[PDB]
Design a protein around this motif. Structure first.
Motif, short mmCIF file in Angstrom:
data_model
loop_
_atom_site.label_atom_id
_atom_site.label_comp_id
_atom_site.label_asym_id
_atom_site.label_seq_id
_atom_site.Cartn_x
_atom_site.Cartn_y
_atom_site.Cartn_z
N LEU A 58 0.68 -1.13 -0.24
CA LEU A 58 0.02 -0.03 -0.16
C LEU A 58 0.81 1.49 -0.05
CD1 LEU A 58 -2.95 -1.11 2.39
CD2 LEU A 58 -3.01 -0.34 -0.06
N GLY A 59 2.08 1.11 -0.82
CA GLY A 59 2.75 2.33 -1.20
C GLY A 59 3.58 2.90 -0.06
N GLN A 60 4.03 2.18 0.99
CA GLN A 60 5.11 2.16 1.95
C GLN A 60 6.39 2.00 1.29
OE1 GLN A 60 6.45 3.90 3.72
NE2 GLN A 60 6.38 3.42 6.09
N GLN A 61 7.46 2.54 1.32
CA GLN A 61 8.60 2.41 0.90
C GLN A 61 9.79 2.28 2.12
OE1 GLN A 61 9.30 4.33 -3.26
NE2 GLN A 61 8.74 6.04 -1.72
N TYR A 62 10.80 1.42 1.98
CA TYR A 62 11.91 1.18 3.16
C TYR A 62 13.20 1.67 2.50
CZ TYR A 62 8.10 -0.72 5.75
OH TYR A 62 6.84 -1.02 6.41
N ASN A 63 13.73 2.33 3.52
CA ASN A 63 15.48 2.40 3.18
C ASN A 63 16.11 2.08 4.46
OD1 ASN A 63 16.24 3.78 0.38
ND2 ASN A 63 14.28 4.86 1.07
N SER A 64 17.40 1.64 4.55
CA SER A 64 17.98 1.33 5.64
C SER A 64 18.55 2.35 6.53
CB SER A 64 19.03 0.45 5.39
OG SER A 64 20.23 1.37 4.93
N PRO A 65 18.56 2.12 8.05
CA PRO A 65 19.16 3.21 8.90
C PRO A 65 20.44 3.70 8.14
CG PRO A 65 18.17 1.29 10.19
CD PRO A 65 18.25 1.06 8.61
N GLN A 66 21.37 2.91 7.76
CA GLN A 66 22.27 3.68 7.10
C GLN A 66 22.31 4.45 5.73
OE1 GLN A 66 26.65 1.13 6.78
NE2 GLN A 66 26.07 1.62 4.69
N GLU A 67 21.58 4.18 5.31
CA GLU A 67 20.88 5.36 4.00
C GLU A 67 20.43 6.41 4.43
OE1 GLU A 67 21.45 5.38 0.82
OE2 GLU A 67 20.00 6.91 0.29
N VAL A 68 19.39 6.30 5.47
CA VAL A 68 18.80 7.54 6.10
C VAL A 68 19.63 8.58 6.92
CG1 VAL A 68 16.24 6.71 5.39
CG2 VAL A 68 17.22 6.58 7.58
N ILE A 69 20.14 7.90 7.86
CA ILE A 69 20.92 8.54 8.82
C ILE A 69 22.35 8.94 8.21
CG2 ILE A 69 21.82 8.66 11.25
CD1 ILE A 69 18.89 8.46 11.17
N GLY A 70 23.08 7.88 7.67
CA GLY A 70 24.32 8.16 7.27
C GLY A 70 24.52 8.85 6.03
N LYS A 71 23.65 8.65 4.91
CA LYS A 71 24.02 9.17 3.45
C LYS A 71 22.98 10.16 3.40
CE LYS A 71 26.51 5.81 2.22
NZ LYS A 71 26.93 5.64 3.71
N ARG A 72 21.69 10.32 4.08
CA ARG A 72 20.71 11.43 3.68
C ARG A 72 20.89 12.43 4.93
NH1 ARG A 72 15.62 7.91 0.75
NH2 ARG A 72 17.32 6.78 -0.64
N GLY A 73 21.45 12.16 5.90
CA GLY A 73 21.49 13.04 6.92
C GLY A 73 20.48 13.53 7.83
N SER A 74 19.62 12.41 7.91
CA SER A 74 18.46 12.47 8.95
C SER A 74 19.06 12.24 10.40
CB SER A 74 17.39 11.58 8.57
OG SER A 74 16.22 12.08 9.35
N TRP A 79 22.56 4.56 15.54
CA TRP A 79 23.65 5.10 16.30
C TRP A 79 24.97 5.14 15.66
CZ3 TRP A 79 23.06 8.84 19.51
CH2 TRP A 79 23.93 9.33 20.35
N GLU A 80 25.00 4.04 14.88
CA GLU A 80 26.37 3.95 14.42
C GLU A 80 26.46 4.95 13.03
OE1 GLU A 80 29.47 2.62 15.18
OE2 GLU A 80 30.48 3.09 13.46
N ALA A 81 25.42 5.00 12.18
CA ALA A 81 25.27 5.64 11.24
C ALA A 81 25.44 7.08 11.44
CB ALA A 81 24.21 5.61 10.46
N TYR A 82 24.98 7.48 12.78
CA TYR A 82 25.23 9.07 13.13
C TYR A 82 26.61 9.00 13.57
CZ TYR A 82 25.48 11.89 17.35
OH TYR A 82 25.99 12.82 18.05
N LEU A 83 27.16 8.17 14.38
CA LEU A 83 28.67 8.36 14.70
C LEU A 83 29.66 8.44 13.36
CD1 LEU A 83 29.15 5.91 17.78
CD2 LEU A 83 28.65 8.11 17.84
N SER A 84 29.32 7.91 12.34
CA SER A 84 30.17 7.75 11.24
C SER A 84 30.20 9.01 10.52
CB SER A 84 29.63 6.56 10.24
OG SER A 84 28.63 7.01 9.57
N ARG A 85 28.95 9.56 10.42
CA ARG A 85 28.64 10.86 9.63
C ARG A 85 29.31 11.94 10.35
NH1 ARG A 85 22.76 12.01 10.05
NH2 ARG A 85 23.39 13.75 11.69
N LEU A 86 29.16 11.86 11.79
CA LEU A 86 29.67 12.92 12.60
C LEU A 86 31.26 12.83 12.59
CD1 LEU A 86 28.39 14.53 15.09
CD2 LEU A 86 29.09 12.59 16.58
#
Ligand SMILES: N#Cc1cn([C@@H]2O[C@H](COP(=O)(O)O)[C@@H](O)[C@H]2O)c(=O)[nH]c1=O
Ligand SMILES: N#Cc1cn([C@@H]2O[C@H](COP(=O)(O)O)[C@@H](O)[C@H]2O)c(=O)[nH]c1=O
Lengths: 257, 257
Positions: free
Chosen positions: A206-222, A249-256
């Motif tokens: 029903l139209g939901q799309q998923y991306n991973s924590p590393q995509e959204v936090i690490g690559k997309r900056g959320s 948490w790790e995606a955020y640390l990486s980006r940091l």
């Protein structure tokens, strides 16, 4: 240079609700928001209690609760205080200010009497924020503006997204961030919360799309991931919440750095 | 050469719910929808009873009712049946299909069990309609898509509006028309319902804008006026409803020829 959650909690223009959230995120090493889309009060409370240590926030849809009473919200608040997480009612206010003001304060849900955060669609124009803030400011609450959505065919793109950012930036006394799929504001005093997250690629029927924590936090900056079915449908919800927490948490640390 | 309401109630592609509405509008000589934005069940019911003969539709915000129960809704259905009007819950569903399906069926309100019509924002993409229709189809319910809004700053314009129209065309089994400020579809199978209406042009202090029944029905080509404060603020709500009914009905006749 990108600031940590703990430092962002001290920014001069930070909202008290965002500051409270950022400090518990840093303290608990969690940027996971549990989406507790359940049909029974006891399930909501059971999950909040068991997963509270792993989460910075619990997202509710009180209108899906078959047995909602304000005594359930009272009990939820005790859990939020004990485990240290904010409560975010995903009400999606989306009408004229005169109406949403009543929907936020009144009625059987009395949302402003227990929800640290609510969200609002920006499609009606800034009146939606001006009405909400009449109720939320006295009650020391904050609001998230829906700048992008996770679903296929979403119209919350381009100039619509830019309009949400501007509305937020001009109502900082009340608006503390966004629902978005990526970083949409450059001002670090705003939070970015992203639903449509699972470890594995996919979506629903029903139209939901998923991306991973590393995509959204690490690559997309959320900043924060919102996860429902990824956790709730798991056999072991505690292990699932820990997996999403450690991923975000790790995606955020990486980006940091 | 524009078709009367009675004629449209017979169009090939006409939804059963639109047909029932158009026939009672024709019978009763009313294209007035009362927006009963009140906080007491007793006031809602006294209004529905007194004003029933004057209106084609009653628009509810059940989340504003301080004393909502399903028994109140039972009574309202009885009055809708006795006076012949449809019940429209202005719920503004505005999320992924998986969530809106539960919000429509479930929770305390059990909206699908008593609302002939509901509305949805199109911002999430067509998933919002796909979710709602899963619940509303067996129940012979209908849906209105919000193509335009009445408020200052509304982003429901241009390509956003065109998207709402396309979505409605592509889901005509369930979607019976629009919330809009003006005729937005050329297909006469679609209803246009317009809020932001008072006899006196102007607005409120939170972004609402008002235009006359003559402007909205007569000039802009909409079918039904949605009127809240213009009626509910009057000492005599019945006299006020009749003033709006006559204004809207005559503006419609004027357009016909
Ligand atoms: N605003 C907003 C949004 C809210 N949500 C909400 O977030 C939750 C996602 O749940 P799940 O797909 O089970 O991980 C669900 O409650 C849904 O209503 C989105 O999925 N996408 C959005 O764009
Ligand atoms: N969709 C939608 C809309 C709904 N409404 C609703 O219509 C009603 C208008 O009431 P009033 O301004 O009191 O005549 C109110 O319940 C409001 O929430 C709009 O005013 N504008 C819209 O664009």
């Amino acid at each position: 240079k990108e600031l940590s959650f703990g430092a962002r909690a001290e920014l001069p223009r930070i909202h008290p609700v965002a500051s409270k959230l950022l400090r518990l995120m840093q303290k608990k090493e969690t940027n996971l928001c549990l989406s507790a889309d359940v049909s029974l009060a006891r399930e909501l409370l059971q999950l909040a209690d068991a997963l509270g240590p792993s989460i910075c926030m619990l997202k509710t849809h009180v209108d899906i609760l078959n047995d909602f009473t304000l005594d359930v919200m009272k009990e939820l608040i005790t859990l939020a205080k004990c485990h240290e997480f904010l409560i975010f009612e995903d009400r999606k206010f989306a009408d004229i200010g005169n109406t949403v003001k009543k929907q936020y304060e009144g009625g059987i849900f009395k949302i402003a009497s227990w929800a640290d955060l609510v969200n609002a669609h920006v499609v009606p124009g800034s009146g939606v924020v001006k009405g909400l803030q009449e109720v939320g400011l006295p009650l020391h609450r904050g609001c998230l503006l829906i700048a992008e959505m996770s679903s296929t065919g979403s119209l919350a793109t381009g100039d619509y997204t830019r309009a949400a950012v501007r509305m937020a930036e001009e109502h900082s006394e009340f608006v503390v961030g966004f629902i978005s799929g990526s970083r949409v504001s450059m001002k670090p005093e705003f939070l970015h919360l992203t639903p449509g997250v699972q470890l594995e690629a996919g979506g629903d029927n029903l139209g939901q799309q998923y991306n991973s924590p590393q995509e959204v936090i690490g690559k997309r900056g959320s900043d924060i991931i919102i996860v429902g079915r990824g956790i709730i449908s798991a056999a072991d919800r505690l292990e699932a919440a820990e997996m999403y927490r450690k991923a975000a948490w790790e995606a955020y640390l990486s980006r940091l750095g």
